[PDB]
Structures are given as structure tokens and as C-alpha cells.
Amino acid sequence: QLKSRVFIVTGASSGLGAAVTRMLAQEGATVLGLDLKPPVRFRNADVTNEADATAALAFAKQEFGHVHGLVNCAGTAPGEKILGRSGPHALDSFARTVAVNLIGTFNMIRLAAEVMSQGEPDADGERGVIVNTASIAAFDGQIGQAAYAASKGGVAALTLPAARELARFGIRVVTIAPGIFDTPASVPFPPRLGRAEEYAALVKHICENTMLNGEVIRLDGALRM
Amino acid sequence: LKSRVFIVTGASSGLGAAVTRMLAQEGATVLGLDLKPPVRFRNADVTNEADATAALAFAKQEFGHVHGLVNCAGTAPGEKILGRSGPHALDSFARTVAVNLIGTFNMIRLAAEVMSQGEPDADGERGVIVNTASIAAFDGQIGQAAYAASKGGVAALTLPAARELARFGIRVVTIAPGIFDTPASVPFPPRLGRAEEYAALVKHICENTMLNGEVIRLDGALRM
Amino acid sequence: VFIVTGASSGLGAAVTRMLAQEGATVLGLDLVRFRNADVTNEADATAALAFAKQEFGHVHGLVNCAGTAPGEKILGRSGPHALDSFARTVAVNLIGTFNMIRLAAEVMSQGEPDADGERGVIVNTASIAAFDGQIGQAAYAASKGGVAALTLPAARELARFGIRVVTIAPGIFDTPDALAASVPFPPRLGRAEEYAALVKHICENTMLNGEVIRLDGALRM
Amino acid sequence: QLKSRVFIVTGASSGLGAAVTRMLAQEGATVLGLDLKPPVRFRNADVTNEADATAALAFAKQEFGHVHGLVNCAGTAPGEKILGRSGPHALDSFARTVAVNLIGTFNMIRLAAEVMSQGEPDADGERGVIVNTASIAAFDGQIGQAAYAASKGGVAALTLPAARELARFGIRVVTIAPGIFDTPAASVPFPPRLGRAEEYAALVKHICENTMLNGEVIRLDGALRM
User: Fold this and answer.
1) Which of B5, B147, B150, B206 is flagged as catalytic?
2) Can you list the domains of chain D with their CATH numbers?
3) Cα–Cα distance between B131 and B162 in angstroms, integer?
4) Distances in whole angstroms, Cα of residue A61 to Cα of each of A100, A104, A131, B137
5) Using a CB-CB distance cutoff of 8 angstroms, which residues of chain D are in contact with residue C195?
6) Dihedral of the alpha carbons of D96, D102, D108, D109, in degrees to the nearest 10
């Protein structure tokens, strides 16, 4: 049960983050939802920014004493071709998508983990769970997804060395790679957009299933782009 | 899962026994198949067409319609391609491939036919097929050619199967387990898996409609 | 000295061509010298490998290109997929290459290492269906998926004797229409010689081991 | 043949880029060697800076007339734990490794590809080949390799969307994931040794010649799993 477990949810104001936050709250969990702007406490923070990350962790210690969970859902999925009519893909645009998607989730990991590390382990020796949001684009990059695919491919790659290291402290790191979700016909089955709640239902299952660790789980109705 | 009819392979022990246990406790009805006795149990050779056919008739008559198939029939033998004795016996590779791959496919093609004829639930779903590969399919070690190749063919089966079966609202998902205690080096949890953990992933797969066509490693982050 | 499986046509025939040009000795096997053999059969394969040892005195290479790539649904108009058809595809594609691997490896076992310590190189033909199985390719995907998974345990064991094991997963080749149009680049069918060319890159580059290499023009089915 | 073809190579001063530049020179190719420090024409460039990268492409457009080939070999490979004795992994250190390994290769790719774009197709219809250098850590990330692994995982994941877009113009994009090489061992199954940079170069060459190789990541690692 997640009851009285303290989770940090990133991208918490909408989409996958909102749905995870909601799921945790229904399970009696305690949540710090973090996002750039406003839609269980909510704080504003740029996950990319060191000082904002630090201050949200300091808010967590001070309000709650412990952190047992981190769910990285802050994310941007722009579309932009490597060679546009206009000229080449903006460099800034690519660096920014990498900064939000990859650097931000790493930033939340290095700092959340420091804290989970200090808490009481459970019966299995578990101290913490970290879940990240990659995307199916990490494996099936479509035209115009270069930045996005590279970004989420970095997240997907990060899972295993993070799992191997944090195993020491009994912290799990698992990554979900979602397909198309109804968030702010092609799909073999079910032939429809994923509902955020289905994403959250997998998140909770990772939280509960101690043997899931170091893996990237495709959640995509068998879609291949 | 309550009042749903599931067929489970390798049901007399290990993963399959834990899956039958999980299902029954969820109020589902289970036809557990295995070669030898340990919810009804019936003897069957998952490999044999006629035998698999008869098992599916028993289920059609007896319980009426089939919702679920969990392939947990397998063998995990170990044999060098080149031994002091000589090269790896051919019979032996073929038997491992018969039980793991050919037996899984057989159970899929016949369970699928029956699910095909059933009525779709609230999401349009007519059945779920969960397959047991192995982390050997990606991390084969010395000694594991037969098992690795055999489980690797089950893994690759997943997607063409889900793609076709989508037509009928049948999902196909494969799990790739690591080391489970069935009949030290693991990163975390630094222990063998309990079979019950495998059954709980299967149950989550049953519950989560968006899981389809995927191979899910369940192995405490172990790379062999 | 090379044994090439499925050497009568397709990719096997181009592989025999390429080694023939390179001035190697080839034993072509199929249902430079040919020899009629069933890759599946424990006897034919032994007799084949015994042929090769007395007639040739060593074995340095094995290229498995014996294959069937047939099409059939899991639920057909008529009924379920035939079990024997499925078993037969697994047999040719997977049992047959394993049969050839266990035997050729026994011989390459007993030969002289070169300057890199290499006694042998085995190249297997998987397929992209092993990762992108399209509807109707369950048997094909399953068996070629078996091949692909074999590569690493096999390379890890055979490392002992300096035998490398590499698998190629080709996309669409003109071997025995605009499906071609759908391959991103080059937008055509692959030529068997290009396949043979990678077999050659692999025989040449000692660091390629234990890998499945896509040769598919960026195609995803 | 690589004869008369013009290549840009990145991290050209040592290790893998050096050996690539060597093999291209020996096959009679014109080579633009980019790197930060010196040991075919060499220029000093930061593959990460937009203006350095634009200045290198203009240079090679004016100087040689075309660009047919980009080989990305610039890269760093720090090890730092997520949670170290001192404290958590520095933020900016992680960014910096992502910036050299990932933002760097993308910068070169977007700019080279623009130029390759503007040339004539060769006999196979090919205007370019881009080979990237990822690493086995993209799939087998070891302890301490988080930043390196994510970086290279980025590079690996880029390859298919790039080949898919750039197919339109006949530019192939292929990524090699090398294992342990002798660049600035009883563990590798066979050969039980560090790879020589020449063997990396030889795969780069195989890729330039083989038109069917596109959108893929090739492990070049002697079957090592980290």
C-alpha cells in the first residue's frame, strides 16, 4: 500500500503527472506535485533548475520528513524536422527539449535519491521507488521527432545504470515508455488514445512489484510508429 | 477477473501454480494444464495438437467460453554446444524448442480461436494471452543456447501475434522473468523472485488494457 | 575454407559467389562444390562435416542462409494456423542452423588460430521480422527470433576456442511491386551481393562478435 | 570507393576520430578534421558551438565544394556516481557530458546534412553518410556511467528518426556502439583485448560502402556485456 508513503510527482499540473498525483492521493499517499505553474501540496519549480530542485527537496524534508517515491512526468514533445523549409532545426530548440526531458529528470533523481537513501527500508529492504517517463519515440523515432526521441532515449538508457547504483540503498528505478495518450485509430488494440489513468495504474504496479527494476516498459497498445 | 475462464499451462508447479493460485483467489475459474498432476487440473501435452484440441473442448463444454491464457509451460535445461562428450545433442535442442516455443504457439492458436467467438468486454476485449519467455532470450549465458533460442522465439512471437489478434480484441503480452525460486548477484531485491510476484505482474497485465505486444523484463535489474 | 548453407540460390548463392571471388574454398549445402544435404537432419549434417574434413582438412567459416519465409495467419479463413507448418518453419530456420553450428564448431575447434587467436566465424541469417513481425509472419518471426537470441550465448561459449558468432537481420531482398517503395533509403529491394558484402565485412573485422546487425535500409515493418 | 569524397570528422585529434581520419586519408578522401586541440586539413572547433559549426561547414563548402560524409567521434566519458561520498552528482557536470556527446553530434548533423542536401546524388542515389559514435554503455550502462550512458543512449535513439527524415535526400544515418577500445579486457569474450582504433575505422568504412546499412546501431564490442 502507498498509504502514508511520500511521493514527489513532476509535471504534476496536468496530463500523466496529474493522473499519477490523483492515483497516489486515492491510495492515501502523501504527494508533493511539482510543475512550472499551477493546475497533497503543489509547489512551482523548474525541474531543470538546480536551486528550484533543491528548494522543493528542502520543502519535502521540512513538511513531510521523508521521501519514498519520485515520478518524473515533466516533459515536452515538440515536432521539428532536421531540415525544415525554413533552414535547419534550431539548436536551442533541441538543447531545450533535452534539458526538460533528460537533465530535469536526472536532476530530480540525484536529489530525491539522496533523501530516500536516508529513510527506513521495508521488509524487502526497499527504501525508494523512482519511475520515469520515456516514450515509445525512444525506439520508434518518427520524422520530426529527433529532439524528442533523443531526449527520451537518454531517459530510457539512464534507467539501468541508475538501477545498478541505487540498488545499494534499496532504491528501484524503472522507466515507462508510453505510446499515445489523451493528454495535453492506428493503435492495434485498443484502437484509441491511452487514458492517463492507465499510465498511473502501471505506475502503482511498479510501486508494489518489488521485482520490477532497471526495465523500460512499453505501454502502447502494441503501436509501432 | 472474477467469473472469467482462464487456461493456465505448467500449472502443477512454479510460476503456473502461483498463477492458478492468484486467479482462483480473484474469483476466476481455471483450467490448469500440466503433464503430471500437482479450479480443475487436467493432463495434457501442450505440444500435441489433438491433446491441446481436447483440452480446449473440455473447457468449451465445461466452463462455456475462454477469456485467458497463461503459457507457463517450459524447461530451463543447461548444455554446452561443445562438451567433453562432444557437440550438444540435436534431440535435446529440439525438445526444448518443442516445449517452450511450439507448445506455446499451439496454445495460442487454439485459445485464440475460442476467444475469437466470445463477446468483448467494456473495452472491446475478448481475451488476454500472457507468455513466459525468459531474460535468457536477451542475456543468454554459457549453457543456455537451447533455452535462450527457444524463449527468444516466444519473445519475438509477441508482436506479430498482438498485431493480428488486435482484430478480435485479443491482447498478447510476454513476460521475461529473471531468477525465481521455482522448483546473490541480483542488484535489487538481492534475492530470488517469489512466484507470487510473477503472478501479480500477470494480474496487472490482465487489468491494464494498454499493455499489448510488449516483452516485460521482470528480474530485479539483473543482466546475466 | 567455408560451408555455406542454402547455397543453391538467394543469399546463400551470393555468399558462395563472394567467397568464390575472394579465392576461398566453399562447400555449398542445399536440397566451390555442392553437396545435397538437409540442414535439419543429424546424419546429412555429420556426413557433410565429415566430407569437409577429409576433403578439406580444416573449416574456417560457416554461413547459415537456409531459410523459409512463409506466410500464414494465426486465425485463418479456414481455421487456426497448421501446427506442422509452424514446426516445419522453426525446424528449417532454427533447428537447422543450430545443427550446423554445433557441428561446424566442433571442427573449427580443432584448427589453427590465426594471428588474432581466431579459429572460426559463424554468420547466421535472422530477419527483421524477429523485431518487427508483421501479421501473418508468426512462424517466421518466432524462428528468426530464436536465431537472433542464439547469437550471444553461442558467442560467449565459443569465445573459448576463438570462434566468433554474428547474426545479420536482413530486411527485403530480391531473392526468391512497391513494398520496395516503402523502404526509406535506398528505396528498393536489397541486392543479395550487399548482404554478401556484410558477411565479408564480418569475416574481416575481429571485433564484431555476439551482435545481430540489421541490414534493412532503415525499414520498420 | 571513398576516392575524391569529402568527409568531416569530429574529435579528429585522437582515438577513434584520429583513426577514422587516417583510414579516409589512405582511401584517398579529402578530410576536414575538427577538434579542440591539434595532434586532409585540421581546424580547431567546439562541435557544441553553433558558430564554430557553421564556420566549419562554410569552410568545407567554399574549400572543397561538397560534403559527402560526417563521422561524429567527439566525446567524453566521465564516471561519477549519482550519490557520491561527497554528495550527489554535480548537475552541470552531467549537462556538460550531454552537451558534448549529444548536443554536439546533433549540431554537426543538422548542419552537415543541410550541405549534403545541396549536392548531386551518386550512382546509388546517395548524397551523404552520417556515422555516429554512441557506445555500449547506451544499453549496458555500468555504475558511475549515468551521464555517459544517457548521452549515448540519446545518440543511439537519434539514429532512426534522422535516417527516416534524411532518407528523402539520400543521406544515410548509422550509429556504431563501440565497446572497450584502446583510446585515451580479460573481460571481453573474444577477442580478449581492447579493440584497436583501426577496427572502428574499418566498420566506418564498411558502412560508407554498404548502401543497405541505414537507421541502425551496430555494437562493436567482442560480445562484451558490461
Assistant:
1) B147
2) 1-225 (3.40.50.720)
3) 12
4) 24, 20, 20, 43
5) 212
6) -160
